[PDB]
Ligand binder design. Structure first.
Ligand code: VBG
Length: 213
């Protein structure tokens, strides 16, 4: 890939992300000061685990629709066979949503944007998944403490999705060429913005895979 083709791949991935980012960053950042009161937190804690599961599963389904649209707008992804497109989305959609979450996470007070306001992990107590919730918050904190930008989320999530190691891929080598190109685009963008120093602080390769499995 040429240095011009890579700059075009960066722009192409960031364009797809911009069209499918679901929530405006500026609205998430403005709402940081709008925090749930103790009464509102208690209201969530009193809900049944079934009600919390219905709300969260609904928000998760909606977030996954935007990730599918992000994938459909990557010309590289659309050149893959139907089997591989399904395999990559089924294995990676949830991991992409997990990376996207860091933009809605406030590392100053350990809160996340949820249904209109920011709240801590105790908001999700009725689910009875405190170890899972803790892990999600820790993963978000590790990216949020790096001030992970919109273009870094765009390039990183494209890499999360285009993974040649996913079981069931019919054209592994085609996926790998697209993955290698996306890694070059990611590193190139980090150099132009003097952000290469985040590479050594980024979560290890399969941390998302183990968290989501
Ligand atoms: C584009 C953007 O700016 N976004 C920020 C706002 N959005 C967002 O945070 N989410 C969309 C749906 C949000 C969501 C929904 C459900 C889940 C749950 O775990 C899914 C899961 C596993 F089952 C296993 C391993 C990892 C994960 C993950 N991720 C599920 F079981 F209910 F499905 C849960 F157990 F954690 F609840 C996880 C996040 S959410 O806002 O409701 C929310 C819920 C919990 C939480 F700790 C934080 C938030 C995650 C959407 C993305």
């Amino acid at each position: 890939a040429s240095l011009t083709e890579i700059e075009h791949l960066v722009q192409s991935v960031c364009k797809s992300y911009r069209e499918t980012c679901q929530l405006r960053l500026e609205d998430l950042l403005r709402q940081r000061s709008n925090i749930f009161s103790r009464e509102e937190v208690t209201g969530y804690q009193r809900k049944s685990m079934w009600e919390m599961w219905e709300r969260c599963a609904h928000h998760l389904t909606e977030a996954i629709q935007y990730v599918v649209e992000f994938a459909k707008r990557l010309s590289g992804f659309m050149e893959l066979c139907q089997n591989d497109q399904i395999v990559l989305l089924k294995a990676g959609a949830m991991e992409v949503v997990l990376v996207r979450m860091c933009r809605a996470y406030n590392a100053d007070n350990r809160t996340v944007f949820f249904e209109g306001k920011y709240g801590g992990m105790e908001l999700f107590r009725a689910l009875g998944c405190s170890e899972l919730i803790s892990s999600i918050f820790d993963f978000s904190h590790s990216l949020s403490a790096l001030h992970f930008s919109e273009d870094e989320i765009a390039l990183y999530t494209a890499l999360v999705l285009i993974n040649a190691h996913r079981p069931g891929l019919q054209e592994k080598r085609k996926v790998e060429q697209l993955q290698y190109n996306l890694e070059l685009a990611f590193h190139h963008h980090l150099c132009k913005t003097h952000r290469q120093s985040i590479l050594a602080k980024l979560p290890p390769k399969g941390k998302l895979r183990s968290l989501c499995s």
